[PDB]
Amino acid sequence: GTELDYDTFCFYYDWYGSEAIDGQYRHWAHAIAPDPNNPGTIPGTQESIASNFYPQLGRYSSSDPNILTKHMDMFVMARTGVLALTWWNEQDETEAKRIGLILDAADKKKIKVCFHLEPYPSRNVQNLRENIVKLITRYGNHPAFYRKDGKPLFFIYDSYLIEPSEWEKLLSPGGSITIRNTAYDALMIGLWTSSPTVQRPFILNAHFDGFYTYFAATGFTYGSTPTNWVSMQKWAKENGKIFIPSVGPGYIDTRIRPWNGSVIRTRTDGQYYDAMYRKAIEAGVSAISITSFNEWHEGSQIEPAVPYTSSEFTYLDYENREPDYYLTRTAYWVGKFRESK
Ligand SMILES: OC[C@H]1O[C@H](O[C@H]2[C@@H](O)[C@H](O)[C@@H](CO)O[C@@H]2O)[C@@H](O)[C@@H](O)[C@@H]1O
Ligand SMILES: OC[C@H]1C[C@@H]2N[C@@H]2[C@@H](O[C@H]2O[C@H](CO)[C@@H](O)[C@H](O)[C@H]2O)[C@@H]1O
């Protein structure tokens, strides 16, 4: 009852910086988003960071090998065997260095790493293919690189921004630039957002291998409404698709999106997380994703947080629970998920 689960994916963000390592407390400092219907910036000082919560590890660097060790030990505590790494195609030496550091640290703990392909500028199926080839070439032989039944796995965020007719070229076995039957074949997991009438043909026509839902906030989309998960799984099974619902402990992003309060989901001392995780397991899925390890801007993190009140902000915290509660509660749910597999 302590081993890692390799069908449990935890979304991980490597974009945090410190002045010492990165030259700026990157992401702890963050622009405040204008209201879609100034706004200024959060300066990323000790007192004022771009989160409604406050990390136990402080304003850390994602490139600090000592932080990475600590994070891998947290994954072990949570029993989450796969780190699903945000990937922004920065094409810079700092990105390349950090990915290697994360793979190296993960391997010491038998954690695996897969990539979460983000909506980088001009993303399209051709440069996606080239980037999948690059990632598999660079990292595919690393011992921590994830495979499921012989295949890499990628999550594709906001996949609906690319038309199914383009996806088909990459993901159908007959597609013009197919990855199927090549050295670069992979399980491609697209984002299910809206109603079945839209999403079912999208997924089929795009030739995705499966789908995930991402959002930690229940009801934000059809896909992130857990009462839909039984029927989504039924459809997945009938159509040979892998459904990987995303569960999270809460949501709050109002430091960076002050206009977005309607998306707040309160943690209620863990009861929100328990409810969402239970629904995923009851749906009878093969794999679960966790939003998130450390999306601190969106308040979905399971990473330890501490009480903190500064002269600039009174942070939220884990209340009646201890800082590592969400790690240990994840481990509880991983056990229940395994019991179901
Ligand atoms: O606008 C706030 C909203 O922004 C982000 O989500 C956007 C997009 O990535 C999603 O696919 C669609 C889903 O309908 O919504 C937005 O356009 C997220 O940061 C989200 O959590 C946030 O509420
Ligand atoms: O990993 C998928 C998304 C997770 C999270 N909603 C953000 C998206 O990133 C945008 O918003 C971040 C702040 O929450 C911002 O730092 C980043 O630059 C944005 O691209 C992720 O795409």
Residue having the nearest C-alpha atom to atom 16 of ligand 2: 27
Please list, in sequence order, all residues whose beta carbon lies within 8 angstroms of the beta carbon of residue 45, skipping any fewer than 6 positions away: 25, 312
Cβ-contact 226, 234 below 8 angstroms:
no
- Paired tokens of 162: 């690319």
Q: Residue for token digits 């810079």? A: 92
SS3 call for 83: strand
Which of the ligands is closest to the CA of residue 161?
A: 1
The atom of ligand 2 lying closest to the CA of 298 is: 14
d(CA 298, CA 287): 23
Q: Tell me the CA–centroid distance for residue 118 and ligand 2, in Å.
A: 9
Cβ-contact 154, 131 below 8 angstroms:
no
d(CA 20, CA 29): 14
CATH number at residue 183: 3.20.20.80
Using H for helix, E for strand and C for coil, what is the string for 132-161? HHHHHHHHCCCCCECCECCECEEEECCHHH
The atom of ligand 2 lying closest to the CA of 116 is: 1
- Paired tokens of 290: 């966790």
The total domain count for the chain is 1
Ligand 1 binding pocket, CB closer than 6 Å: 158, 193, 215, 221, 260, 263, 298
Which of the ligands is closest to the CA of residue 27?
A: 2
Integer angstrom CA distances of residue 35 from 32, 120, 265: 9, 22, 19
d(CA 215, CA 250): 10
| Segment (H or E) for 203 | helix 196-206
Residue 81 buriedness (CB in 10 A; 0-12 / 13-18 / 19+): buried
Q: What are the φ/ψ torsions at residue 20 (nearest 5 degrees)? A: -60, -45
| Segment (H or E) for 102 | helix 93-108
Which of the ligands is closest to the CA of residue 51?
A: 2
Please list, in sequence order, all residues whose beta carbon lies within 8 angstroms of the beta carbon of residue 229, skipping any fewer than 6 positions away: 243, 245, 279, 280, 282, 283, 285
Please list, in sequence order, all residues whose beta carbon lies within 8 angstroms of the beta carbon of residue 112, skipping any fewer than 6 positions away: 6, 81, 82, 83, 106, 144, 145, 146
Closest CA to 301 of 96, 57, 100: 57
Q: Tell me the CA–centroid distance for residue 213 and ligand 2, in Å.
A: 15
Its domain, for residue 200, covers: 1-341
Cβ-contact 42, 115 below 8 angstroms:
no
Question: Which approach determined this entry?
Answer: X-ray
Cβ-contact 160, 202 below 8 angstroms:
yes
Q: Is 87 in the pocket of ligand 2 (CB under 6 A)?
A: no
Q: Tell me the CA–centroid distance for residue 275 and ligand 2, in Å.
A: 25
